[PDB]
Design a protein around this ligand. Structure first.
Ligand code: 7SA
Ligand code: CA
Ligand code: CA
Length: 415
């Protein structure tokens, strides 16, 4: 694995990451107090499957509960104590050690925007009236106020003033803690619409400057005020701007929006397809996550924006053969039987030398999506839901078949 920032200083850790999302939404219910144990036991398999990194659940304990029903998953944590619903502090250290020992960098989900302010038994107790909270200031709506330079979570009563020096420092120090005893190789920042992107740059500079990061900005143009340039911008432009200011890769919700609403041909309009390498190399691509996708267990998980099963193989073939940095969802890989297919695609990606900045060209004249990808070692031809007959119709050189699945709806050839 190679380290390094992008030419623009963006923390894509060499551009060669292949990431596993290491949980689904219902883990705390399906494997009570046992997930870190499971990850420890699976560390060698995860490495053998070809992942360079794993996105871990939020490590800060969360004993919240609401009624659909949920709670405890990490996104309404009450303090930084690691003895939460995924396992104990000791078990987390064992899992992170096993994953790192196997060559899988450990990326923690971190949630700076808010905390479970009302939880009665916690280590972090911030009073009102000192500027620590969004609602220490007038709060007329879901947009920045004088105590919170980003959006708010629901009603905002639990949003922290992350720009207050004490609160900034609290998170800075906890990121350093995670990088030390918990072996962090980077971070996934939750709800990045909730606080300034420049604060993510600062936190990473202070506590993990050479690590990998990714921000979750899931916010469409119509969610911005009519006078904001983003209101008339593309999904790509919105997430790219965040990445520029955080100096962090960003989840490719532009690609996800095309996968949900467009045709397969239109998947070329994700951030990861952009002809400018400074744009596509900051995209972190995915098929589904714990919010968008199903999960095993109660209510099928959240399934806010799930990709239908007739496109899952196509979507994994696209993200695993293309630029940007791909993320594989736990349940596709290890619950629902796509593992062998995904393993094969990961090997294709590695053997071809595809990285986040590899060139990708899209070809006209066929149905579906037809792309040529320039890896450092091989050129790939990728044909998804297409009437393309063979790679010589669209590329020079000698090719052999690498993938042929779903009655030819997924085909990949390599030079
Ligand atoms: C879940 C995601 O929501 C938002 O994305 C929106 C997106 O902006 C919108 O365009 C839309 O996108 C898609 C949409 O999915 C698709 O169907 C549609 O066709 O197209 C849309 C795009 O155009 O919808 C997305 C999902 O709602 C955000 O932008 C995104 O960042 C977030 N994902 C991350 C954020 C959180 C929060 O940490 C996590 O949420 C998770 O953890 C939260 C905390 O436990 C869960 O919240 C629960 O617990 C809270 C304490 C509770 N809130 C209490 C607290 C307070 C405060 O004192 C009170 O004001 C409330 O009244 C009270 O009830 C919630 O009601 C309850 O639902 C949340 O449901 C869950 O998703 C996710 O797992 C993480 O990945
Ligand atoms: Ca790397
Ligand atoms: Ca906020």
């Amino acid at each position: 694995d190679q380290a390094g920032k992008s030419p623009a200083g963006v923390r894509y850790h060499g551009g060669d990451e292949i990431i596993l999302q290491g949980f689904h939404w219902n883990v705390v219910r399906e494997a009570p107090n046992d997930w870190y144990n499971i990850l420890r036991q699976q560390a060698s398999t995860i490495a053998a499957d070809g992942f360079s990194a794993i996105w871990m659940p939020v490590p800060w304990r969360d004993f919240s509960s609401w009624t659909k029903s949920g709670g405890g998953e990490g996104y309404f944590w009450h303090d930084f104590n690691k003895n939460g619903r995924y396992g104990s502090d000791a078990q987390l250290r064992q899992a992170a050690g096993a994953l790192g020992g196997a060559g899988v960098k450990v990326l923690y989900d971190v949630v700076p925007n808010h905390m479970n302010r009302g939880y009665p038994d916690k280590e972090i107790n911030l009073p009102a009236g000192q500027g620590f909270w969004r609602n220490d200031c007038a709060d007329p709506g879901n947009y920045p106020n004088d105590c919170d330079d980003g959006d708010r979570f629901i009603g905002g009563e639990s949003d922290l003033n992350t720009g207050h020096p004490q609160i900034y420092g609290m998170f800075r120090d906890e990121l350093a803690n995670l990088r030390s005893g918990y072996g962090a190789g980077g971070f996934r920042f939750d709800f990045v619409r909730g606080y300034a992107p420049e604060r993510v740059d600062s936190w990473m500079s202070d506590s993990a400057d050479s690590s990998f990061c990714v921000g979750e900005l899931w916010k469409g143009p119509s969610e911005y005020p009519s006078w904001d340039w983003r209101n008339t911008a593309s999904w790509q432009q919105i997430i790219k701007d965040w990445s520029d200011r955080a100096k962090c890769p960003v989840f490719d919700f532009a690609l996800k929006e095309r996968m949900q609403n467009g045709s397969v041909a239109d998947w070329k309009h994700g951030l990861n397809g952009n002809p400018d390498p400074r744009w596509r190399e900051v995209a972190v691509t995915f098929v589904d996550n714990h919010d968008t996708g199903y999960s095993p267990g109660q209510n099928g998980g959240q399934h806010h924006w799930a990709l239908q099963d007739g496109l899952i193989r196509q979507a994994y073939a696209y993200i695993l053969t293309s630029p940007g940095t791909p993320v594989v969802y736990w349940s596709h890989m290890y619950d629902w039987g796509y593992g062998d297919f995904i393993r094969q695609l990961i090997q294709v990606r590695r053997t071809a030398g595809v990285r986040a900045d590899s060139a990708i060209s899209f070809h006209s004249g066929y149905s579906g999506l037809v792309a040529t990808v320039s890896g450092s070692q091989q050129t790939l031809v990728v044909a998804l839901n297409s009437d393309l007959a063979n790679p010589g119709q669209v590329a020079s050189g000698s090719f052999s078949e690498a993938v042929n699945a779903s009655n030819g709806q997924v085909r990949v050839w390599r030079s």
